[PDB]
Amino acid sequence: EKVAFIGLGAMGYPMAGHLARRFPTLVWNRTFEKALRHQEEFGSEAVPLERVAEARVIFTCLPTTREVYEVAEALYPYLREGTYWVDATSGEPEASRRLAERLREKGVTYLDAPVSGGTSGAEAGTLTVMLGGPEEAVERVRPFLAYAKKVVHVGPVGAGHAVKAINNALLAVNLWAAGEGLLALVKQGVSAEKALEVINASSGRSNATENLIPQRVLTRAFPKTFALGLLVKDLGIAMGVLDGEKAPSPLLRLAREVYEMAKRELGPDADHVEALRLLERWGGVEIR
Amino acid sequence: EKVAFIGLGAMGYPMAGHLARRFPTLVWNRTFEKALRHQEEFGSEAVPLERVAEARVIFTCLPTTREVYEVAEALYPYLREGTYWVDATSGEPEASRRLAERLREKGVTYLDAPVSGGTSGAEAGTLTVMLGGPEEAVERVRPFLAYAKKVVHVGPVGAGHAVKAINNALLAVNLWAAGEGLLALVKQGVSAEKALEVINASSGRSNATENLIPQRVLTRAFPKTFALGLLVKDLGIAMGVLDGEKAPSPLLRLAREVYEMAKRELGPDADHVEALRLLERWGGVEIR
Amino acid sequence: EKVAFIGLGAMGYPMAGHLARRFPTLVWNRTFEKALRHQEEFGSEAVPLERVAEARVIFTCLPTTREVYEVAEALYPYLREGTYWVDATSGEPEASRRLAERLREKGVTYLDAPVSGGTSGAEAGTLTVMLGGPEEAVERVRPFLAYAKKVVHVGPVGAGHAVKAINNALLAVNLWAAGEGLLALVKQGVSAEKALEVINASSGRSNATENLIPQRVLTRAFPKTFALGLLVKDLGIAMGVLDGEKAPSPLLRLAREVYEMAKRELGPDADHVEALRLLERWGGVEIR
Amino acid sequence: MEKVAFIGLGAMGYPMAGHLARRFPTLVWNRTFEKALRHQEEFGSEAVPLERVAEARVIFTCLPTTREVYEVAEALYPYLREGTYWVDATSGEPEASRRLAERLREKGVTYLDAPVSGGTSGAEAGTLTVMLGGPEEAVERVRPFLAYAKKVVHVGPVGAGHAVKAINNALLAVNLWAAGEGLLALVKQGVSAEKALEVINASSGRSNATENLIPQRVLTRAFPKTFALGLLVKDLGIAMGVLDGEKAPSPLLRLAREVYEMAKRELGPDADHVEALRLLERWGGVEIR
Ligand SMILES: NC(=O)C1=CN([C@@H]2O[C@H](COP(=O)(O)OP(=O)(O)OC[C@H]3O[C@@H](n4cnc5c(N)ncnc54)[C@H](OP(=O)(O)O)[C@@H]3O)[C@@H](O)[C@H]2O)C=CC1
Ligand SMILES: NC(=O)C1=CN([C@@H]2O[C@H](COP(=O)(O)OP(=O)(O)OC[C@H]3O[C@@H](n4cnc5c(N)ncnc54)[C@H](OP(=O)(O)O)[C@@H]3O)[C@@H](O)[C@H]2O)C=CC1
Ligand SMILES: NC(=O)C1=CN([C@@H]2O[C@H](COP(=O)(O)OP(=O)(O)OC[C@H]3O[C@@H](n4cnc5c(N)ncnc54)[C@H](OP(=O)(O)O)[C@@H]3O)[C@@H](O)[C@H]2O)C=CC1
């Protein structure tokens, strides 16, 4: 059937590409040049936002729930009953539930579907998806997830965003702690390369030490794939998840504050892994 | 040639078993019944501590450098020139360098060779070894490491212990943060099983979420393989490493304090993963 | 002119008494018994909630903004233009700003006016008031604050609540840090009494070391004046203040988590200063 | 006749030795000797080469760290006479100071750690608080010579004074920084820092930091230089050593050392300790005033 994608960003562009190669796909983006470019590259069709309502399934991958609200309100007058809204934005659980209630007024079923895998996973089409919403709706949308591999239904609306936020909080902690430790080792003469060869074959290994630090930090490449400002935004959502019960969570709480320092020192558009540059700055040595 | 192993503990017993099946091996343990048991099971030879001096390579896997010192002093009169001392204890860099100096007076070459892989890695014989010491000595001992797989030379004496401490600090942080995050998700109705299925296929994954939490926490098994007290001891050594330059290290500094709380609440002989029981206690819910 | 006071708790009862001495005063309490008692003691007049709208100045001293909202909704149909609402509740800045906007629709000017000084200060009529609101409105209500001594205009609506929350957050940090410090000194043999004599005459002094620890901890008296659960609640409001700009605030964020630990270990009913009992438990020694 | 001597005429030492100079015949020495000469002209002390310091019955030192105390002790070692007292006002290390005490004992010299609190203003007023560590007999003998102090407390054996000083400064650090985080948040939402402090200083959250440092140095934008940020970090380092004794859970104090290290790395060790708040203003994009 016909699907539509809104938000052709670092993640949305490649994600919509997989959709375009499997289904008749309509695409829209605020900066429309991206939509025209996408049409030429993948066979999708660039359309005015209003036409997105023609789709059986509408996909969004925007910065925050705030922007998803914006596009939903713009489409509200045209939305048709029986339509599904798959939101791949790393959004806010509560605001998303309110959005789902609003969409139901038009017979549109909303599901939070944030993802993990980065731009490389998006390009490969192997993104892990954490779905939140009705089981019946989940079954209906699974076949349309052409850009994913592992798809997990984690609960009702909002549960997906909650799991994504916590996942990113763990990534943040793992990455920053590794930075602190490696900086200390490098300063006393240990090869960062050697330290990681050991760590990645030991109990302290994480996706951060295995697939981010060696490739982006040791190489000094620091490619831009996920804005530091967006990671801080996710950490903020994670704090919201922690506020539910407010059980003692000193480590994750501190994580939000340290990444905020990095954001203030390096800027929101720096890559998230560049947060380690702050440690290098204070340390007076590069993790190299 | 002859090798000898001192300290048949959770790690030492299986480690010495690999040596016993490759080389003529002598074994000794403070609680001697363990040595007699080892001899019966692996074909090693239980001997008085003094006879360990007959070995070309002496291995130790004790609690701390303090105990390595105790054993070394007891052996001083018997140590023979040309002997190698491979210390698999998760020891202190500085104290080990001092010990290496005094052993060098007897013609004994000390190498810090701490390991990672846990009791399961020790049983399989796939331990990762991080060696600190002279290049020539490293090449001489490699063939005797029958309980290892990945063996990395990370620097001079003490460097091995330094890397191990940092590796364990990363494990500690990764593990606790995961606990804080999963606790929050569980309290709002999300299955830890589901959350981990997502996380272990996402960017927040780590050895802690992949191989410790599902196996020990979700199952409620909490097997005893690595004492919480020893992990706190390792964290203490890591803080010594951070003290070298004293670059801002908020996350790792906090990690030592939270695990200390767990130790004081649960006892030093609880398994290190049981630290998460403190979070379950505060949260009033089990991580499942 | 006529005034009305809502909420005759440990703070409100004496506060309304000071008002009764100067102006015709109407009083209301969730439970009538207290209002009748007040009338019989001060000459105020106990009335049904509806009559409170007859006053020129309405005062509220309730548990939280939630209750202030409840009373506001009940009085809304009766509120008259040109009326002032002075809220002495330790409320939430944001929710209170929304309330002020709602009340403005009725020509009612809301001013947040939390107090410090406790029951002793309320009884003596020497409370310190931190006012948030328009300059002209502040000048208008100053002469009505019969229960106060120091009255300070700290900013726009919400600023009073914000200062109250931050103040208690600082009290929390100062008290806990002092505990960690004193615990270490006591463990190594230093007299808690002598340590405090020095500190209280030195740069590290605070109201906590000066008027709380020596009188309540060293003596083991631990009198109940401000519940630990209430301090945690105020710390929560403080985190909300922090959330406005989200500038790096590691110390204050950590403070909320450590007091939450105390609350979960000792219970909400324990006095706030008893939080140090948790440190005593871990340290294995009393701060005395 | 009996004389006293002071080594290290710094921010603290200069005025401290001034109080001694107007009270007893005092010999003074400073690495940068021009400082010693100026002191003689200003207080009536006698600037002399380091060797003459051993002529004193009581020798005072107020140097950066125990390290400098050590090298000055070695230089004087061959001249030290039995029966002399060494009053060390340096904010030093407990353990290193104990070894120094043993070493000095070889010459019949009695060491006492006597770190102080009160800042340069307290030093000038002669109202410093002193925390003594050492033998009761020695303490009683030195009390009458502490002309720059008001409150004097014997807290224990050698090293105990330095320990209490380190913890005191750790508390100051936490109090000052937390107030900064809180004030930064308040100013950002339209709250008057001046008025907020008036309330806080009349409430439970008050501390010496909010009462006598922030209003006078930050709100005014004056940021006078009286106590180097680098030295405060050094003190926090010593405080961490005190926490290492038992290693009971101490999250707040541990974190305090890390945040001030950040400030030191960003602003430099020679900035004033209170300038650490400039880092918060930097991140906040607003000044606390
Ligand atoms: N990058 C990564 O590695 C991962 C990111 N995510 C999450 O995916 C989401 C998007 O991230 P990413 O693709 O990197 O983001 P980018 O910044 O690359 O793209 C953001 C997209 O949102 C659009 N947008 C922004 N504001 C508006 C608006 N007001 N109205 C309409 N469209 C708007 C942009 O349009 P325009 O082109 O006009 O600017 C752009 O298409 C975020 O929630 C992020 O946290 C999840 C997993 C991984
Ligand atoms: N367990 C794990 O998962 C891992 C542990 N390590 C490190 O390995 C080292 C040992 O750990 P683990 O095997 O779990 O320890 P255990 O507590 O199981 O064993 C400790 C061993 O040291 C011996 N020992 C203790 N005190 C003395 C002494 N005074 N003189 C002589 N021998 C003594 C014990 O003898 P006895 O039988 O008489 O008590 C025992 O053989 C530690 O440094 C630990 O941090 C490293 C990686 C993994
Ligand atoms: N400032 C304050 O508010 C307080 C400081 N303290 C403690 O007092 C001690 C001194 O602080 P402060 O007075 O501010 O320090 P300053 O940096 O102002 O002065 C340090 C003094 O030590 C001397 N000095 C430095 N290195 C050497 C050396 N290698 N050999 C001989 N003399 C040396 C200096 O000599 P020169 O003139 O040649 O440079 C100077 O007289 C520190 O331990 C500090 O932590 C305690 C309470 C308060």
What is the DSSP secondary-structure string of D68-113? Answer: HHHHHHHHHGGG--TT-EEEE-S---HHHHHHHHHHHHTTT-EEEE
Query: Phi/psi of residue D115, each to 5°?
Result: -60, 160
Which tokens is D96 given?
Answer: 């290193």
CA B54 to chain A, closest CA, distance in angstroms equals 32
Which tokens is C264 given?
Answer: 């979960």
DSSP B183: H
Distance CA D78, CA C7 (A): 77
Which H or E element spans position C183?
helix C159-187
C127 bridge partner residues:
C148
- Known catalytic membership, residue B164: yes
The identity of residue C217, as a single letter, is V
Give B-chain residues touching C260 at CB under 8 angstroms. 282
Q: Which of D272, A182, D275 is nearest to B245 (CA)?
A: A182
Concatenating the DSSP letter of every residue in C6-25 gives E--STTHHHHHHHHHHHS-E
Q: Which of A117, A283, A127, A138 is nearest to A207 (CA)?
A: A117
Which tokens is C224 given?
Answer: 């109940």
> Chains with 3 or more CB pairs closer than 8 angstroms to C?
A, B, D
Check if D18 has its Cβ closer than 6 Å to any atom of ligand 3.
no
Distance CA D152, CA A129 (A): 67
Residue whose structure tokens are 């929101």: A268
Active-site annotation holder among D3, D107, D151, D165 = D165
Which tokens is D46 given?
Answer: 């006698």
Q: Residue A66: count other Cβ atoms within 10 Å of its Cβ.
A: 12
DSSP D200: H
Ligand nearest to the CA of D272: 3
Check if A16 has its Cβ closer than 6 Å to any atom of ligand 1.
no
Which H or E element spans position B131?
strand B127-132
Sequence-distant (≥ 6) Cβ neighbours of residue D78 within 8 angstroms: none
Answer for the pair A165, A234: CB distance below 8 angstroms, yes or no.
Answer: yes
Which tokens is A205 given?
Answer: 């290994």
Question: How far does chain A reach from its first CA to its final CA, in angstroms?
Answer: 50
A25 bridge partner residues:
A3
Distance CA A91, CA A230 (A): 11
Of B163, B176, B258, which is closest to A198 when you measure between CB atoms?
B163
CA B236 to chain A, closest CA, distance in angstroms equals 13
Triad D233, D196, C268: Cα angle to 5°: 80
B127 bridge partner residues:
B148
Which tokens is D193 given?
Answer: 């820092």
> Helix (H, G, I), strand (E, B), or coil: what is residue D54?
helix
Q: What is the CA radius of gyration of chain D?
A: 20
Alpha-carbon distances, residue B232 vs B169, C231, D106 (angstroms)? 9, 31, 40
Q: Residue C214: count other Cβ atoms within 10 Å of its Cβ.
A: 18
Q: Which of A55, A39, A47, A77 is nearest to A2 (CA)?
A: A55
Distance CA A138, CA A148 (A): 14
Distance CA C38, CA C26 (A): 10
Residue C11 assigned ligand-binding role: yes
Residue whose structure tokens are 């460097």: B159
Answer for the pair C95, C67: CB distance below 8 angstroms, yes or no.
Answer: no
Distance CA D199, CA C116 (A): 9
Q: Residue C33: count other Cβ atoms within 10 Å of its Cβ.
A: 11
D194 Rama class: left (phi>0) / alpha (psi -120 to 50) / beta: alpha
Angle of helix A159-187 relative to helix B159-187, nearest 10 degrees, comes to 170
A157 bridge partner residues:
none
Q: Which of C152, B191, C66, B243 is nearest to D199 (CA)?
A: C152
Distance CA C188, CA C190 (A): 6
* Determination technique for this entry: X-ray
Which tokens is B186 given?
Answer: 């569980």
> Cβ separation of D189 and C245 shorter than 8 Å?
yes
CA B284, distance to chain mean position in Å, is 32
Distance CA A234, CA A256 (A): 9
Atom of ligand 1 nearest to the CA of A34: 37
In B19-99, where do the E strands start and end?
25-28, 45-46, 57-60, 83-87
Triad A8, A9, A11: Cα angle to 5°: 100
Triad D273, D278, D280: Cα angle to 5°: 115
| Domains of chain A: residue spans and CATH | 1-156 (3.40.50.720), 157-288 (1.10.1040.10)
Length of chain A measured in residues: 288
Distance CA C206, CA C193 (A): 16
Give D-chain residues touching A260 at CB under 8 angstroms. 283
Distance CA A196, CA A212 (A): 11
> Cβ separation of C258 and D251 shorter than 8 Å?
yes
DSSP A200: T
Which H or E element spans position A110?
strand A108-112
Distance CA C220, CA C281 (A): 14
How does D110-136 read in b/e, with b if 16+ C-beta sit within 10 Å?
A: bbbbbbbbbbbebbbebebbbbbbbbe
Distance CA B98, CA B138 (A): 19
Tell me, letter by letter, the H, E, C secondary structure of C79-105: CCCCEEEEECCCCCHHHHHHHHHHHHC
Answer for the pair D191, C241: CB distance below 8 angstroms, yes or no.
Answer: no
Distance CA D104, CA D98 (A): 10
Check if D225 has its Cβ closer than 6 Å to any atom of ligand 3.
no
Distance CA A198, CA B149 (A): 11
